Design a protein around this nucleic acid. Structure first.
Lengths: 205, 82, 80, 45, 123, 129, 157
RNA sequence: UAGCUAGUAGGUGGGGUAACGGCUCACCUAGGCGACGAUCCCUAGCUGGUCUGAGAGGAUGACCAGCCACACUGGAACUGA
RNA sequence: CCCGCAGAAGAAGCACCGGCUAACUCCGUGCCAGCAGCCGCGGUAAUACGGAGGGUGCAAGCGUUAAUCGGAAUUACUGGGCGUAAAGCGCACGCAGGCGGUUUGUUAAGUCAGAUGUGAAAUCCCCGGGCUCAACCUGGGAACUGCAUCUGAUACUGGCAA
């Protein structure tokens, strides 16, 4: 299912740091970003009006690490939900379990938190869960099992998140390594630059 | 002969029974007069294990409906003091 | 009250029986216009107390032939 | 492999029947520019 | 128009016929394939296009195109027929599935080898 | 051949609004006065008068706002070849509420928004947008 | 803040004595992103000299549109010469989902979440005159309460 | 595919069925159905549903459930509630 | 289902890359071999053939074929047309049908409002619950646009009387 190819190549197709490799080091410039996604990278695309919608859908997939048939089941659920569809869509993606583990601080990247969920190392609301697509309801707690606690990787990734934004919709202790998912996030918080305007329109044609 | 028997709906290895009033000469999932509750044998330590509309079961026994031995045992589970 | 239908006689001459057109005013399903449709019925009476071309009153009953399961109630507005 | 030619049951000549057959019709090409060179959309774009 | 005129004769739905009479909606048909040959196309193209007639297993006698470079069919060679016209040969409305029951895959494909019936090379 | 008198009322209004006519005179009827009382009370028509003794001849003084026709458009909906009867919840709304739809109900002729409040429908008549 | 945008470029001919002389016709639509549109056609011998000739026409041909803060007021039709455009306010119908050359003028209009459909012809030059006909033919409850009802609280509800 | 129909359409009476009834038989009346499509021909199990579509509709009716039908082919009855 | 063991260890393909439609160059071949859904490519500098490097798409799947609806307002009730594009009978009279000026009365058939009976369950939709999650299973509700009945309302339509 998972991509698991070169993942800093997926940033250069957007020209956007999708936080895929980034991890332990600081500001990279270690791929010739904005310049060359392949052999014919130095050429500028015309990028027609279908291309500006597809490259915005692929960006939101390549951030959260979601394949298409699963991302199309989020949209089909986000349309039937009450309210705004592009705000139901990002709430479902941000409420994934491997996202919440990433947002609490556990895991330098998101794929690390996907493995940290998958290998029975994450205890949400007193139970161990394999599935990274677990949909974390508000007022749930989520923590680390002591079989995998302070195992030299969650320690480094937790201090690394001190230089990050520290999201509003969740509290985390990070000494007991048990964070409480407080509420579902609002669109005014989450990153403001992904243009969910276009993703709703692409599945309509 | 009408009878108040279970139905065996549900998934595989996850049975869910519909205690139901039907003619005897039909299938287990076949034609029934009215559903009169449900029975979940594997439910949880939770809120609901079994509902059972006894005002209709007393109505059908008053018409002369037989009761299969699971459903009669579930009336012995939904007792006047239990 | 018994259920009963107005009507109008098509033909008399079949010996203690009479055929009646009942006009029903039904809407078309797709197009929404009301279509004047007709329900012909064989109707029982006694011998010749109603004639051809006049309003009639009909009720449903037990079968009396291969058709003719309806019965006369009364005769309003006889044939002029 | 075989060739389904036009002239059914060719008698005499075994090579001057096929010369009229559309296997050996005259291939004439298109100009550009040249008396008959209008594009309207070319090979690309 | 005129909703009264739509009551007499309803607005009759246009019937579209099938492009491939391959006996009533089946994906492939097996064929006995007499008379393998080549034919020149219609006007603008001028190639030598390989095409076989096919005795289908129901009674139909259709001609059918053989895609790809080089084939091993000979005068019976029972093969499998899929639909799809070629637009360039007159009367050809079918293709042959390369890689099915007699019609071997194309020699040395490397790209697009599901079509043209070539297994993935081991080396 | 004078089949719908009511659509003849409406086409005299559009041709009045288009030609910038001051007022529009037509043969009067019982149903004409009911519809014109709606359009007077709703704001599409100023001051209808029904002056007529044995040949009743009503006139509708038309309304113009800027130099501009107040009636945008007015379509005879339930024309006599196709009668259109609507239920309470099935009652339409023109221009998403800000036009009106004259409906003939069991409590007389009124607008759509009054027939929701009464809670009863009937034959809608026109869509005064 | 002016948000100029391109729709279609076409190559047209004149066919004179020697050969035929080609020229290029742009089609641009500008708009502030809040209730104002404008289009200009523009044509020249060379493609970039046509588009900036089309942008300067679009600035001086602007129409005012009164919109419900992200969307249309009411379902309006827009006929112009081939194009039977319907476009519906879609009260947070979530996204400008309109057809080609109709999506272009509406995304720079200032509306974000309407429905639409073009019927009939689909010529980009005509359908962009067709929707700008519809956005001018749309009127607000601030305006229809100046003719009928004479009360914005009684006209709408 | 323009007229089909002789137990055919109705009546009276006997018989028959668990039960009304041309269901059946004798006798009498000559009707009955039909352009709102009888008759004949082609195709087809029917419904809840399913797929699609913004809707109205269009296509379809596998699994699941309701009804009918048939059990090598044609026909007949016996037993039995 | 839980615990323990070892070892990054046993586990990534298929289509596409001229336009539509996201994604490009080199080599080979020269209207040949071939491609192709449409328009069309190939005649010696082919982003369209074939291979290579690169890229895009989907991913334990990926394509082709077939069938269905959609786009198609391209049978248009919703929702089309008919001077010249497809299309006004050559022109009339006229039965059946369709439609019908104006006022009062009555009728309440059509219509509208309410009630009751029914419209099997599952299904679909809403709010929840149970499998680590989802699919799935399930509780409650809404729906099932209908048909019948009764009670009214009387504007409009129909009947009937003037």
């Amino acid at each position: 299912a998972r991509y698991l190819g070169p993942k800093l190549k997926l940033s250069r197709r957007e020209g956007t740091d999708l936080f895929l490799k980034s991890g332990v080091r600081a500001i990279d410039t270690k791929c010739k970003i904005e310049q060359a996604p392949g052999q014919h990278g130095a050429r500028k695309p015309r990028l027609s009006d279908y291309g500006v919608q597809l490259r915005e859908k692929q960006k939101v997939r390549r951030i959260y690490g979601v394949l298409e048939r699963q991302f199309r089941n989020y949209y089909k659920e986000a349309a039937r939900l009450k309210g705004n569809t592009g705000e139901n869509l990002l709430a479902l993606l941000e409420g994934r379990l491997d996202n919440v583990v990433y947002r609490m601080g556990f895991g330098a990247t998101r794929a690390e938190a996907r493995q940290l969920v998958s290998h029975k190392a994450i205890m949400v609301n007193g139970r161990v869960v394999n599935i990274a697509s677990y949909q974390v309801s508000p007022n749930d707690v989520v923590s680390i099992r002591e079989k995998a606690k302070k195992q030299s990787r969650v320690k480094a990734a937790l201090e690394l998140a001190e230089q990050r934004e520290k999201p509003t919709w969740l509290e985390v202790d990070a000494g007991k390594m048990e964070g409480t998912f407080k509420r579902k996030p609002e669109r005014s918080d989450l990153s403001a630059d992904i243009n969910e305007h276009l993703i709703v329109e692409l599945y309509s044609k | 002969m009408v009878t108040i028997r279970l139905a065996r709906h549900g998934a595989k290895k996850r049975p869910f029974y519909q205690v139901v009033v039907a003619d005897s000469r039909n299938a287990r999932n076949g034609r029934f007069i009215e559903r009169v509750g449900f029975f979940n044998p594997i439910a949880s330590e939770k809120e609901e294990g079994t509902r059972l509309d006894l005002d209709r079961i007393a109505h059908w026994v008053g018409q002369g409906a037989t009761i299969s031995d699971r459903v009669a045992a579930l009336i012995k589970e939904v007792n006047k003091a239990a | 009250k018994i259920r009963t239908l107005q009507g109008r006689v098509v033909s008399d001459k079949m010996e203690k029986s009479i055929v009646v057109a009942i006009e029903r005013f039904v809407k078309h399903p797709i197009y929404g216009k009301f279509i004047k449709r007709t329900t012909k019925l064989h109707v029982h009476d006694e011998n010749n107390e109603c004639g051809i071309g006049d309003v009639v009153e009909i009720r449903e009953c037990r079968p009396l032939s291969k058709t003719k399961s309806w019965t006369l109630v009364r005769v309003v507005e006889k044939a002029v | 492999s075989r060739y389904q030619h036009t002239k059914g049951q060719i008698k005499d000549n075994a090579i001057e029947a096929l010369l009229h057959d559309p296997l050996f019709r005259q291939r004439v090409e298109k100009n550009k520019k040249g008396k008959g060179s209008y594009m309207r959309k070319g090979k690309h774009g | 128009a005129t909703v009264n005129q739509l009551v007499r004769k309803p607005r009759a739905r246009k019937v579209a016929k099938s492009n491939v009479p391959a006996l009533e909606a089946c994906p492939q048909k097996r064929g006995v394939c007499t008379r393998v040959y080549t034919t020149t196309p219609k006007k603008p193209n001028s190639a030598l296009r390989k095409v076989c007639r096919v005795r289908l297993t129901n009674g139909f006698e259709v001609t059918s195109y053989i895609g790809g470079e080089g084939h091993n069919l000979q005068e019976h060679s029972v093969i499998l027929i899929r639909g799809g016209r070629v637009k360039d040969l007159p009367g050809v409305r079918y293709h042959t599935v390369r890689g099915a029951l007699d019609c071997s895959g194309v020699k040395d494909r490397k790209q697009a080898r599901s079509k043209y019936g070539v297994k993935r090379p081991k080396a | 051949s004078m089949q719908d008198p009511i659509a003849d009322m409406l086409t005299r209004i559009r041709n009045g609004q288009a030609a910038n006519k001051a007022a529009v005179t037509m043969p009067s009827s019982k149903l004409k006065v009911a519809i014109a009382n709606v359009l007077k009370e709703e704001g599409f028509i100023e001051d209808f008068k029904v002056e007529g003794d044995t040949k009743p001849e009503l006139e509708l003084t038309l309304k113009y706002f800027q130099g501009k026709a107040v009636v945008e458009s007015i379509q005879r909906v339930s024309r006599p070849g196709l009668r259109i009867y609507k239920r309470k919840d099935e009652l339409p709304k023109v221009m998403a509420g800000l036009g009106i739809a004259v409906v003939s109900t069991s409590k007389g002729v009124m607008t759509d928004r009054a027939a929701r409040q009464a809670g009863l429908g009937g034959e809608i008549i026109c869509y005064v947008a | 803040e002016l948000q100029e945008k391109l729709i279609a470029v076409n190559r047209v001919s004149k066919t004179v004595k020697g050969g035929r002389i080609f020229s290029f016709t742009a089609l641009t639509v500008v708009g502030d992103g809040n209730g104002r549109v404008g289009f200009g056609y523009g044509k020249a011998r060379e493609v970039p000299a046509a588009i900036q000739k089309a942008m300067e026409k679009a600035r001086r041909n602007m129409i005012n549109v009164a919109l419900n803060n992200g969307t249309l007021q009411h379902p309006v039709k827009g006929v112009h010469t081939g194009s039977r455009v319907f476009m519906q306010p879609a009260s947070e119908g979530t996204g400008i989902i309109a057809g080609g050359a109709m999506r272009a003028v509406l995304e720079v209009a200032g509306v974000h979440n309407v429905l639409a459909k073009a019927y009939g012809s689909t010529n980009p030059i005509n359908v962009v005159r067709a929707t700008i006909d519809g956005l001018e033919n749309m009127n607000s409850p601030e305006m229809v309460a100046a003719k009928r009802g004479k009360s914005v609280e009684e006209i709408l509800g």
